Symmetry: C2
Subunit: 508 residues, 2 copies
């Protein structure tokens, strides 16, 4: 906490002094590799180019990101000058870029090698400002910017709550280290960083999850692999690089689990997997923990500076994830459920957090505001609390759940017993096992979905067979609205269908 | 009701309009709200002829696509008809759409020319010839029912529409002598719905066929009532939002529309309270249910005794005679599919209608799954009730179930009414993906409150509710209304309120 530097850059430089020979960054295939000492000097080099080009404290620099080492050197060179690193995705069409430039008003632009052709249009489009190609230990080299603080802006991330508009999310230095400090200080192993361990982010540097993870790893002396992926196989990426920790979104975790099923392999080097963003699928998490690996669901938003709640691997955590738990609050991260919209956590007479309502979060990783948008900021951000927009319940177990707890489905006033539907679907020849799940419906409340594993005998015809069996019943609701032929149905070890894990797998 | 309805009548929209010109050449066919861009049936005929020449001069031919950059005015329907004369396909494109969007229409449809209506003055499409459009010879009066007349975008997906799309339903209504929807020769109609939207295009095109005086485009105002009033409009076609605004406009101004005979509406969830307001003014109404894919309305809910209760209940309509409907219990198994069984009383709505689309343009894979043997998958989820109508939801619990907890609407309103400053209150269900339903609360203020003033009422109600034993019961949203809709017993119409409250 207070013993440690209060900027990201300065924590990176500390690590570099402790282990200047360890690799800080490299791409998956091993190119663009920087040691901590080389990173330090490169950061020195690039910021001297930026100072030369008139970039000062408070200046915005557009970072056209390829997710690689050069992307992170670029952020750190901005940090060196007290400049704000605006993260722009290289893939995006120049019209999106120009719009970022309208909002942020950059003084320069830094272009990573993997966006360079797309970047190439930009220099002509961006005539007004110096746009630089980024390619590749005395105390003076390890000096930071003494005037920058924990509160000072380091980065901007674009988010689109609005269907068309993207808001520029303004992020202080503290965003990156506020939660890791909490963990270390309260001694929690929910998320851990081991000195030197290899990590991998398949998440873009322009997404809060990607930026946050690689930054906290740099501070912690990790070897961060990111950028030059030449395959879609995570298992190949993980194995080949002996990755120890990685940050996932559920659909990536699911693709990993399927890649490991399909090969009867594991990733033995792998220690820890964080995942978040979308709905967790207990089944994939469980398959991953069985294979030796510790996990952490990290719930959070760009506006909250990434994770604000956590669900670490522990007894019963899988049952909780399946029931819809998002996790529990880190110490020093206050959580408030507001029962009625328009009435914030600090409203006079509002009262204490309800156990059901919109989650508001007061964390020291919280964003400083939306760039150039006082009107949308004043509503989402108020006296330290960010409105996350999400509806959650707190149970007696202290965990937050994104849904309520009845063992029967309700479709148009009509109670469906899931087990009974499964029984019906399993009396049909060709069916090896079957399992129903709920499909959300605005007007009917819920519908019945049915997942089906066929015996070995194409079976598209079975769907028709099953459909016709349900047809011969006198409850119209009690009939599956969708019937998916699957290879497996997620089950507890005790043998019970994990219906929430199943619904997730069927709608992909 | 099974066979060809009116086979004596021409099988092209164009011919039917020309037929109108023959019978009433001096009657006004089209005009803008301000009275400019005016064409008589006679002049409409004449301009379609010269416009068609222009088109052929740019090598436009049968099957050639023609991009029609619409301003919803007389120049636009004139354009459509000029395409029709060559058997070219009118690709409807909104002329206020940003450049990139027009560009994709062009890449999708690849037209031989472009016709620009003046109400959107403005390369991008240099490569193709653009014609500016700017406003009886009996001999100058073989396209048929099935040839394509127009493309409408799902906006992106391109819906291919035949001529029969525009007369097949009205030929049925005529054939069966039904008055659900009717067109009177020479009556004034108005369409706030654009030519680029199935509703608007189909509406105006039907009126022209029927010898209507069609007022379209060039709105001199934002007031829907001033337009209807000033033009003495007799029939109109609306979406629920616009209907709500007409009602709102009608309440505030203490007016009726005296000329107004018929209002069609659809496109979103209908609001039973607005409909009832309108009909009490003497106006017949028809809910028209349909999509681009179904060539507009396939189901219709006509003003009738018990029609307001059905609409408040969530009814969408009953099919027209000759239009086939089929609820498939399971997705994937269509009507065609083997041993498909007959229609269920609940499931995904499939339609077999003579107005159905020919398919999506250059999309064989998506088309093959949505349209099979004349049947179209609407994608909508419905229940066929005892009374033969189709409904959007299930029979009411009368209880809001939030995360498994039952909540009493009477109990909730009781609480809000007990707060000083509340003259009356009524709650309503807000559907939720994860917790099922939330409680909404509509409040009628006892007294007027400054723009600042009302909110302390929101907090005070919120506070009061905060202090109750059950978390689920509490209103997730509190909205202030000058009006809570009631049945003629005085029970709250909670669905009408839930539509008005949300907006």
């Amino acid at each position: 906490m207070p013993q440690l530097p209060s900027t990201v850059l300065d924590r990176v430089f500390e690590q570099a002094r402790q282990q200047p020979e360890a690799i800080a960054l490299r791409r998956c295939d091993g190119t663009s590799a920087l040691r901590y000492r080389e990173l330090v000097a490169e950061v020195g080099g690039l910021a001297a180019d930026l100072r030369a080009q008139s970039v000062s404290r408070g200046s915005r620099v557009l970072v056209i990101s390829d997710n690689g080492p050069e992307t992170y050197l670029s952020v750190l060179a901005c940090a060196k000058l007290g400049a704000i690193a605006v993260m722009a995705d290289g893939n995006l069409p120049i019209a999106a870029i120009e719009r970022f430039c309208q909002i942020t008003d950059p003084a320069a632009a830094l272009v990573a090698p993997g966006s360079k052709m797309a970047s190439s249009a930009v220099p002509e489009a961006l005539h007004s400002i110096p746009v630089i190609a980024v390619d590749i230990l005395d105390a003076a080299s390890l000096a930071g910017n003494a005037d920058q603080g924990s509160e000072d802006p380091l980065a901007m991330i674009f988010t689109s709550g609005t269907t068309g508009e993207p808001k520029a999310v303004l992020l202080a230095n503290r965003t990156f280290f506020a939660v890791p400090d909490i963990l270390q200080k309260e001694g929690l192993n929910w998320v851990t960083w081991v000195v030197g361990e290899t990590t991998y982010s398949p998440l873009p540097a322009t997404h809060i999850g990607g930026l946050w993870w690689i930054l906290t790893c740099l501070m912690h002396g990790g070897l961060c692999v990111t950028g030059g992926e030449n395959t879609t196989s995570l298992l190949e990426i993980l194995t080949t690089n002996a990755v120890a920790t990685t940050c996932l979104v559920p659909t990536l975790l699911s693709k990993l689990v399927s890649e490991l099923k399909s090969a009867n392999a594991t990733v033995p080097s792998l220690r820890l997997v964080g995942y978040g963003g979308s709905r967790a699928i207990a089944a994939d998490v469980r398959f991953i923990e069985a294979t030796g690996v510790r996990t952490a669901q990290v719930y959070g938003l760009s506006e909250t500076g990434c994770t604000a709640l956590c669900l670490p691997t522990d007894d019963g955590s899988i049952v909780k994830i399946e029931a819809g738990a998002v996790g529990r609050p880190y110490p020093g991260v206050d959580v408030y459920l507001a029962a009625t919209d328009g009435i914030g956590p600090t409203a006079p007479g509002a009262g204490p957090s309800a156990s059901f309502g919109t989650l508001w979060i007061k964390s020291p990783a919280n964003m400083l505001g939306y760039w150039n948008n006082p009107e949308r900021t004043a509503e989402v951000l108020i006296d330290g609390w960010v409105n996350t927009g999400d509806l959650l319940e707190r149970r007696e177990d202290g965990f937050f759940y994104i849904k309520g707890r009845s063992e029967m489905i309700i479709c148009g006033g009509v109670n469906i017993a899931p087990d009974e539907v499964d029984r019906i679907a399993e009396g049909v020849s060709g069916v090896r096992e079957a399992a129903c799940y709920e499909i959300p419906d605005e007007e009917f409340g819920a519908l019945v979905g049915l997942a089906v594993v066929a015996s070995a005998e194409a079976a598209r015809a079975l769907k028709h067979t099953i459909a016709a069996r349900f047809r011969r019943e006198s409850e119209p609701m009690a009939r599956p609205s969708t019937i998916v032929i699957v290879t497996d149905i997620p089950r507890t070890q005790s043998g019970k269908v994990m219906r929430a894990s199943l619904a997730a797998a069927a709608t992909a």
